[PDB]
Design an enzyme around this catalytic site. Structure first.
Site, PDB file in Angstrom:
ATOM      1  N   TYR A  33       6.610 -22.298  12.149  1.00 40.21           N
ATOM      2  CA  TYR A  33       5.675 -23.340  12.560  1.00 40.21           C
ATOM      3  C   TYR A  33       6.125 -24.733  12.138  1.00 40.21           C
ATOM      4  O   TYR A  33       6.015 -25.685  12.927  1.00 40.21           O
ATOM      5  CB  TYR A  33       4.260 -22.988  12.105  1.00 40.21           C
ATOM      6  CG  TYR A  33       3.718 -21.781  12.862  1.00 40.21           C
ATOM      7  CD1 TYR A  33       3.388 -20.619  12.189  1.00 40.21           C
ATOM      8  CD2 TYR A  33       3.560 -21.811  14.238  1.00 40.21           C
ATOM      9  CE1 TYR A  33       2.890 -19.516  12.864  1.00 40.21           C
ATOM     10  CE2 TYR A  33       3.072 -20.719  14.931  1.00 40.21           C
ATOM     11  CZ  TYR A  33       2.739 -19.573  14.235  1.00 40.21           C
ATOM     12  OH  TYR A  33       2.248 -18.477  14.904  1.00 40.21           O
ATOM     13  N   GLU A 127       5.451   6.575  -4.888  1.00 46.54           N
ATOM     14  CA  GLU A 127       5.084   6.321  -3.503  1.00 46.54           C
ATOM     15  C   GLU A 127       3.632   5.868  -3.337  1.00 46.54           C
ATOM     16  O   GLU A 127       3.401   4.807  -2.760  1.00 46.54           O
ATOM     17  CB  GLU A 127       5.280   7.542  -2.595  1.00 46.54           C
ATOM     18  CG  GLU A 127       4.735   7.320  -1.194  1.00 46.54           C
ATOM     19  CD  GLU A 127       4.961   8.463  -0.227  1.00 46.54           C
ATOM     20  OE1 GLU A 127       5.854   9.313  -0.432  1.00 46.54           O
ATOM     21  OE2 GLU A 127       4.235   8.510   0.782  1.00 46.54           O
ATOM     22  N   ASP A 179       6.283  11.672  -1.994  1.00 47.54           N
ATOM     23  CA  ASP A 179       5.797  12.914  -1.399  1.00 47.54           C
ATOM     24  C   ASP A 179       7.047  13.757  -1.109  1.00 47.54           C
ATOM     25  O   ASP A 179       8.104  13.150  -0.914  1.00 47.54           O
ATOM     26  CB  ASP A 179       5.083  12.641  -0.074  1.00 47.54           C
ATOM     27  CG  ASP A 179       3.686  12.076  -0.237  1.00 47.54           C
ATOM     28  OD1 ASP A 179       2.988  12.468  -1.202  1.00 47.54           O
ATOM     29  OD2 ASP A 179       3.272  11.239   0.598  1.00 47.54           O
TER      30      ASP A 179
HETATM   31 MG   LIG Z   1       3.841   9.937   2.085  1.00 43.95          MG
END
Ligand SMILES: [Mg+2]
Ligand SMILES: [Mg+2]
Ligand SMILES: [Mg+2]
Ligand code: NA
Ligand code: NA
Lengths: 290, 289
Positions: A33, A127, A179
């Site tokens: 901008y 995570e 995970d």
């Molecule tokens: Mg995950």
């Protein structure tokens, strides 16, 4: 074209000079901008403005943030044995990350001006925000003298920079806990390890495919997209092709056909991750991936 | 019904235990704990979530007050505010005027935070980039206001934090978003309009009129944007309940454009802080709701 991009790069470098002389910054959108004042050298779109900033980093050999250009995304949350210090006209500003209680410190978009002091032993990059909440609440950082940094998905640039600075400036191993799924391995962990901001020494301590078996974790079946991510990685990913343990782990997950969330440890109790899994996993570095 | 009744009994037994041990369980934690419940184990995450939601609604008690907390953390906060907690090692005070370049990360559960503030209002800012600019220019000190980012549609923890500040300390909630349908109808709307709603929240800007008045750099409305507005006008209860919002959305349709809140940087990096916001906050006739 040629000349237009060069004129825009010249204007962008004059803007970076003004930022640095005024101790200021410009976010990526702010820069775009600001470019609307450059007459015929204005950027037509956000991507074109970002392209010049990326190219300045590549051409000057300087991080974009050291030229004054910062991300639109903020960093994650941090708690643990760490002092974040900033010098001001009035004196010294200290943020003690062991005194934040239920909350945490929100890593800013630009971490360049932060001074870091710590006697921690390692960094634990987590995570999920839910897992960070459990580890923060149970004061895992105190008992194990480690800095907890959430990732919240694929880590933002500011998060990556914060962890890398801690790692490089204070000789702190980077232990990653995601995970147990392809996205955790090939997007979240991989981005930390491989990507200027990469941390090649970062180690995935868990949820590994073998962890799913060893801890008998509640699973979910791999989805179509997961299988494709694994297959694509084994064939084309240069990171995966360099580490036989990663090739083996990914082939094992494909054969198992299942995945497990890092909070699935709560089947064995809310504190099981804190008192059994993490202590065992941090101690046994033969179970880490790299 | 039989299984759901068994599952509800187990979930409340769990809640009682969480409350008795001063603990909590995230939604995923609750689901995985339920894998020990034999025939009452949840089949999937959604089933577990549904019992928690139903317990909240049936009993008329917030989720978090039963001990069940969200998976998402809250956003970032700075300004004249002290967050206080009573712990085993003594009283902890987090002074949100002393965080420097950074900010306080609102936790997943805000139930146990004590809040002390002499602020005048709360400024709820959509983007983390605009939050960074207002933090860095100390807009919160100059105007004695607590800055809370939203970072897209506000997480539940963020909504709860803003609602507690508003209700417990009598602080107006001024909302500053991008001037686009998502900003109005997803971000602002979620904050204003459900047990965590803040009906008095006011959208101070980027309004469609602001786009004209400040001559902001714009971008064409996309296909989806136009559909969002037209769906909003015809089927949205928030929009259909407010005439001024109907007028503004039709105005944006006529214009065919949208603007980002950081597009004020065309007039300088501090224009938002020195000119736009001071102006908007002083005159409530330019607010939307
Ligand atoms: Mg995950
Ligand atoms: Mg406890
Ligand atoms: Mg937006
Ligand atoms: Na251009
Ligand atoms: Na079920």
């Amino acid at each position: 074209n040629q000349a237009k991009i060069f004129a825009q790069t010249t204007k962008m470098l004059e803007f970076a000079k003004q930022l640095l002389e005024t101790d200021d910054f410009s976010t990526l959108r702010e820069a775009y901008y600001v470019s609307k004042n450059w007459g015929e050298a204005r950027f037509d779109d956000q991507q074109a403005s970002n392209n010049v900033i990326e190219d300045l980093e590549a051409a000057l050999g300087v991080l974009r943030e050291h030229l004054g250009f910062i991300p639109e995304e903020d960093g994650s949350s941090v708690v643990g044995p760490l002092k974040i210090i900033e010098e001001t006209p009035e004196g010294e500003l200290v943020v003690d990350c062991t005194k934040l209680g239920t909350g945490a410190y929100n890593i800013p978009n630009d971490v360049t001006k932060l001074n870091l002091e710590t006697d921690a032993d390692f960094i634990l990059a987590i995570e999920t925000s839910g897992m960070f909440a459990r580890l923060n609440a149970e004061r895992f950082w105190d008992k194990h003298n480690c800095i907890l940094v959430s990732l919240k998905g694929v880590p933002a640039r500011a998060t990556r920079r914060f962890i890398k600075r801690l790692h490089e400036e204070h000789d702190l191993p980077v232990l990653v806990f995601t995970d147990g799924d392809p996205y955790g391995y090939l997007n979240i962990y991989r981005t930390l390890k491989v990507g200027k901001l990469s941390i090649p020494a970062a180690r995935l301590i868990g949820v590994t495919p073998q962890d799913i078996i060893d801890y008998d974790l509640p699973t979910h079946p791999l989805k179509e997209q997961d299988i494709k991510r694994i297959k694509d990685g084994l064939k084309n990913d240069d990171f995966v092709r360099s580490f036989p343990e990663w090739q083996k782990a990914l082939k094992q997950m494909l054969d198992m056909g299942v995945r497990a969330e890092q909070q699935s440890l709560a089947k064995y109790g809310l504190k099981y991750v804190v008192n059994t899994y993490l202590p065992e996993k941090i101690k046994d570095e033969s179970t880490w991936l790299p």
